[PDB]
Design a protein around this nucleic acid. Structure first.
Lengths: 46, 46
DNA sequence: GCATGCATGCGCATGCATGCATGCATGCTGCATGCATGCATGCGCATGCATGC
DNA sequence: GCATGCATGCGCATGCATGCATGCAGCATGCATGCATGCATGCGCATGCATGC
């Protein structure tokens, strides 16, 4: 609601990790032997 | 052929870019409007 | 029947596989700079035509 | 016939959309330490039994 600047941008990291919301979600975030889920440098599609 | 150390490791970046081998391969490496193909931090599966 | 030594559980102390956050440094990468290049533009000058006389 | 003025093409500088590499920095990820925790070790000590005399 602020279009006067000429700014919002797309998030740089996946928000699933910082919103540890569900009890099974933080469990789906793990696995693949021993490592941490890494989505990538900028993974958001419109 | 050297197993005495206790070392080879998996490549950290995709080798498709440094081996600009085919004439259509360097063309498949582009697109998606304006950006550079980014495979990720470590993308090799055995 | 009395004396004896063994095997059975208590009652200490120590080490050890799991597991997770923090500060420092690594390693990449997106950004700002400089530049080559070739197409278009905005321009003044020389020629050939149309309109008088 | 002759003198004149306008449209058309030639010649000359300039700007500007594309495009790509390099030095520097900003930026997030992986690593080293440091510790908390609960389990298992193994180790002397007390009790109840089986054997000898």
């Amino acid at each position: 609601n602020n279009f006067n600047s000429i700014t919002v941008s797309l998030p740089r990291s996946c928000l699933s990790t910082i919103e540890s919301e569900s009890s099974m979600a933080n469990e789906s975030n793990i696995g693949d032997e021993s490592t941490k889920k890494n989505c990538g440098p900028d993974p958001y599609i419109i």
